[PDB]
Design a protein around this nucleic acid. Structure first.
Ligand code: ADP
Ligand code: MG
Ligand code: MG
Ligand code: MG
Lengths: 228, 320, 186, 320, 305
DNA sequence: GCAGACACTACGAGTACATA
DNA sequence: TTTTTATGTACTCGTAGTGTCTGC
């Protein structure tokens, strides 16, 4: 099998979720944070022709950056990984799929509860600002029938009170009150526009980011509030 | 059957580790106190400490989370340094369990000295996240848990059963072993050997199983295997007789014979002289053997140091 | 210093408001002030037979043990806690001493040796050079000083006084005075 | 042969280290208990401890892995500090053995005090990786292995053969030595000298070979070499004579002579004074020597601690 | 006879080059030649205990005679991480010249060395082909058993009445030739044979004695002993931490030099007092203090002028 | 192309612990 | 009127020096 700068790209991303990854034969890759805070899944170009466990995902993505695009990835006769570049050959380990934290099946979202979208451009403006503004916690609520995001700094106001930042996401059509609170630490997804499906049942709830390329599902936090 | 098998493993004291809280062999009040919890449906903070290993702590930690359907994160205590708490443990605890499950962090074997600072950072953490998430701690030695942490936890103390519980718990293990035998294909010719395994290393139910593993070499426990478990390799009659007669040439000769396992022989001696000698000579024989035992292993020539015990005895010991 | 009306701000305000953390650093460092060691309150409790005030505190089995070693009258019970000290409750160790050392009094001064650290140097530099230990290194100094005046040996060896070696011998500028002294009168 | 030769080395007690578990000279039940394992084809956690050196522990550790076709990692205990476990040992154990082999980590000589904390981190590790991977530990002194680790392991205890095994095992070694001789070109004129080597330092099969090396100086073992091996001294006359005469300058001088094997010399002393002194001085000589023996090995200067024995004797021992 | 012509100390520049030059008794010289015969060296421990016998010399020799690539290291300097870094950097390394690598450790029977010695158990085995170790000891028991197992333990000295006379003849003939080289003059030939008889087993002393009449070119336990006479403490209490280093040696030099300087019935006590202090050393937590308790015990009961 | 900015490494100082 | 033993190991903090990724 052969991996493309497009997919080597989508993986450096799943490295910010789990240091390792489980990939089974196919066009589809999933991973989940060890502590279950984040779940990613995607369908890909390059085709995955054998199963394997990768303990180091980000360091092997580092070693595949040193060969040519034409390089042929195969299971090694000796069961590890052989990367054959044209003039060269590299040997990288496999761990057993016990020490890498795989989800079982590709967790399907429920019927959503509310839905909005976000433009690629406006994701940039959030992440990039959070650093400066020290926005470590954000909240999706409604304002004037129009859903806004809100940045806060949780250490400064533990209460999510002085809202340091806000971005209006689109019109809110239905009728419900909600404050969903997401830890900036779980936002691991790559940039671009996402359809946003969030769901809540009492002390239940979750937020799915549906991208063009891969899907992302992020846990809410416990002070999150709503009637649904 | 009623027993759990992990079937993903061969090591047998780990193949049979209990799935639920009912399977665990526990003192009366300790079981009751756990069933109670599994009821309330939410788990408080809990410390489970041995200090004798293999009493079920790390099993019950995993158990409780199962019986409550916890959303659980298991952690090696010694891997649990401070920045671990800060990043992953804190992410986990701040995460909304979205299917409405108790979040529980099991920190196994947390009693290392080095982890003090991590445990300190933890003291304000367990308070901030107490609504969402709770912590179960396992330790061999409590004093390695800073006091402020024992305040915050229900401290349950394993392996100190009452005289009544010991007897009952053992009886429960003999049955539990028997049912393992049925499962593994080991056949029991004499039951006395299953009982003797349980009694021999009691407090610890792990080595109690892995002792059954290694005495099953031949696939049967017969009254022969019983000899090794209880092991008395003994005929001490030759020494006892020479001590009565207060001679040396004979004692001096027997010393190099028992130089082999001194630890065992000293036992079989204290055992059989205790009955055969006078009451105030009993208080002495312990002073005499007890001292000889202490300094063994400092003693250069074991054979000689054994002779010195024989002379010491023949002189002061008295009986008919 | 312009503007000439500035309500002189304290050392700290200047630092913090302007944000140069090395100023903040000299400022904080100002509070360094490090001593503590209430050890003698425990020790004096054991001498003068008074109220314990312990296990709430930090006890050095070695501090105590050693402090008491100053007085020949204690030795029997300091010694006892030596052979037997390891594996006694930090508290047990304190309960024993209290039930052991009978009278009480002590004034401070502990015993230390005289170090001609001229002479300490010459010995460690023989010990290093020849990979022999200290007692032999001694014999060395004597048969050199006695015969061969050992200026030569001091002459050839001076080459390595490596200033790190100096870190082993004494702790201060007296060290930098030796640096010169062995480089001198050979 | 039937014998293994490493051929990459000259040091001969290491040229002949047994390849398989059958080659090893072991007590009845200990062999049986290992053959049993090599069968099940998977290895449990195992602790193998002497405390007399060179009984076969570190050999059997390597053996078992061979007879099972383990995928093995060998480690110096003292190099085994905590961050070692964390990085390499943990990488290894988490690695899928892809050809389907048992992974086994042999931690040789793990009984240092300093390694306590590493052993503690290990207690939760051996449980997490128990399906894939197991640990074999070698130690001279058990007490240097934290109890929670002895719970997790099958603890097999070397060098305490039964009266029966000793005899068998020795017989096996006399044959094993003979075959080494054939191989090295040493010729045996008298067999009594091969038997005497084995008996002389028994528990320890290493110095037992390296004693064969150094008594082969002349390339034949004749009844002359037999003299040196069985030799000892027996010449205790110099000390016995100086003790009668109750002088010091002489005794004080003899001390450094016997400082070499103290354990032997104390034996030959108790043996020969027992006949040459009065009956109530016999009860004292045991007290005197018995005590001196106990504290040996605590004693800093062995030579001096031997002098202190001589003075003690010359004063109280009274006899003709 | 060998001379190392860049060295300034007698005993260091006249150190025997070969296993021949050394003066030894019978089974000693045989057993050494028998060893160098095989051209590869096993593990070896050498011990006197009566010092100045040639321990440390015979080691550097056996190496020489095998064309061994030899790393000499003092025991006192052989700490745990010394072993880890260099000594391992050494025995792990293959040699260009394809010789045997050998590590001499002089006087390994010191104290802190204890945990190091345990590191070696599994080291001496792990490079057992490349290299081997020669260990020197004044007291054996100060070498943990699992090392004594790995090593061949040869034990020096105690020559026959015959060896005596021949050795004494050798040493005298040897000293002469040294005087020739150094430009020291022999006025009488009974002064030479005095020196050899005087301190006989100890040839190092006897060469050290000679480096002390040599100003012309022709033929320290005092501090403690003085404080013990004076029966004071402030001084004794101060000296304890000084000798805390090698306790085993110090106790020897003490029993040696007090035996002459104290009364006859006080000799029987000094042994009881030091003999006991020796026994319990190594149980004793603070070695420095346990040494103080010896000083006090002595100053009180020891009586003399 | 560089210079600037961010992230990850390592060493030094401090601290605490256990065995001798 | 006081005042710090030796040897090994582990965790955390702080900073400074190294890198790579990025922006005229
Ligand atoms: N057997 C010997 N023959 C010749 N010289 C000796 C002998 N033993 C010791 N010496 C003298 O002692 C010096 C070194 O002694 P050394 O081997 O260090 O004794 P030790 O090993 O007992 O400390 C040598 O320079 C040597 O001349
Ligand atoms: Mg556990
Ligand atoms: Mg070994
Ligand atoms: Mg020397």
């Amino acid at each position: 099998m052969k991996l493309s700068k497009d997919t080597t790209a989508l993986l450096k991303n799943f490295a910010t979720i789990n240091s390792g990854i489980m990939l089974k034969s196919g066009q589809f890759i999933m991973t989940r944070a060890v502590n279950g805070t984040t779940y990613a899944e995607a369908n890909i170009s390059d085709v995955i022709d054998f199963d394997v466990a990768i303990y180091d995902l980000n360091g092997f993505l580092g070693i595949l950056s040193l060969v040519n695009d034409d390089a042929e990835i195969s299971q090694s006769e000796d069961g590890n990984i052989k990367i054959a570049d044209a003039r060269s050959t590299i040997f990288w380990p496999a761990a057993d799929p016990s020490t890498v934290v795989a989800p079982n099946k590709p967790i399907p979202f429920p019927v959503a509860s509310a839905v909005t979208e976000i433009k690629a451009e406006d994701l940039q403006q959030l992440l990039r600002v959070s650093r400066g503004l020290q926005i470590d916690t954000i909240a999706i609520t409604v304002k004037e029938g129009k859903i806004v995001i809100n940045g806060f700094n949780k250490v400064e106001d533990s209460a999510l009170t002085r809202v340091k930042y806000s971005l209006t996401l689109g019109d809110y059509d239905g009728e419900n009150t909600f404050n969903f609170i997401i830890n900036m630490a779980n936002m691991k997804m790559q940039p671009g526009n996402y359809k946003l499906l969030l769901w809540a049942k009492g002390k239940q709830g979750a937020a799915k980011f549906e991208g063009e390329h891969a899907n992302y599902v992020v846990a809410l936090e416990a002070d999150s509030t709503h009637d649904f | 059957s009623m027993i759990t098998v992990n079937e993903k493993e061969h090591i047998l004291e780990q193949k049979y580790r209990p799935s639920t809280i009912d399977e665990c062999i526990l003192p009366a009040f300790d079981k009751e106190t756990f069933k109670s919890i599994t009821s309330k449906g939410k788990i408080p903070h809990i410390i489970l400490h041995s200090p004798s290993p293999g009493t079920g702590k790390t099993t019950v930690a995993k158990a409780l989370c199962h019986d409550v359907n916890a959303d659980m994160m298991f952690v090696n205590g010694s891997d649990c340094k401070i920045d671990f708490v800060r990043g992953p443990l804190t992410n986990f605890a701040s995460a909304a369990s979205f299917d409405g499950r108790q979040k529980v962090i099991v920190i196994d074997e947390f009693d290392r000295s080095g982890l003090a600072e991590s445990q300190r950072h933890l003291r304000s953490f367990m308070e901030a996240y107490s609504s969402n998430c709770s912590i179960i701690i396992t330790a061999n030695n409590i004093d390695g848990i800073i006091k402020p942490l024992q305040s915050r936890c229900r401290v349950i103390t394993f392996g100190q059963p009452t005289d009544e519980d010991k007897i009952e718990m053992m009886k429960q293990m003999i049955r539990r072993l028997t049912e393992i035998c049925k499962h593994e294909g080991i056949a029991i010719a004499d039951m006395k050997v299953v009982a003797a395994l349980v009694k021999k290393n009691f407090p610890d139910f792990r080595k109690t199983i892995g002792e059954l593993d290694s005495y099953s070499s031949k696939g049967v426990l017969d009254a022969g295997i019983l000899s090794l478990v209880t092991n008395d390799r003994g005929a001490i009659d030759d020494v006892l007789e020479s001590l009565k007669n207060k001679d040396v040439k004979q004692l001096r000769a027997l010393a190099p014979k028992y130089a082999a396992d001194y630890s065992w022989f000293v036992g079989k001696l204290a055992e059989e002289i205790y009955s055969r000698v006078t009451p105030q000579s009993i208080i002495r024989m312990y002073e005499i053997v007890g001292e000889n035992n202490q300094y063994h292993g400092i003693a250069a020539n074991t054979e000689l140091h054994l002779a010195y015990l024989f002379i010491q005895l023949a002189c002061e010991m008295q009986w008919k | 210093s312009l503007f000439k009306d500035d309500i002189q701000l304290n050392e700290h305000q200047v630092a913090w408001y302007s944000k140069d953390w090395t100023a903040v650093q000299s400022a904080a460092d100002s509070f360094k002030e490090k001593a503590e060691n209430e050890f003698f309150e425990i020790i004096g409790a054991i001498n003068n037979k008074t109220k314990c005030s312990i296990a709430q505190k930090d006890y050095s089995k070695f501090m105590v043990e050693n402090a008491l070693s100053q007085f020949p009258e204690c030795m029997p019970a300091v010694y006892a806690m030596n052979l037997i000290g390891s594996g006694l409750s930090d508290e047990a160790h304190f309960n024993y001493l209290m039930a052991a050392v009978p009278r009480g009094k002590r004034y401070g001064k502990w015993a230390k040796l005289v170090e001609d650290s001229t002479e300490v140097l010459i010995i460690k530099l023989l010990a290093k050079r020849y990979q022999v230990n200290t007692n032999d290194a001694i014999n060395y100094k004597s048969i050199l000083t006695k015969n061969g005046k050992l200026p030569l040996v001091l002459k050839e060896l001076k080459g390595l006084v490596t200033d790190d070696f100096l870190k082993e011998v004494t702790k201060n500028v007296k060290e930098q005075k030796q640096l010169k002294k062995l480089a001198l009168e050979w």
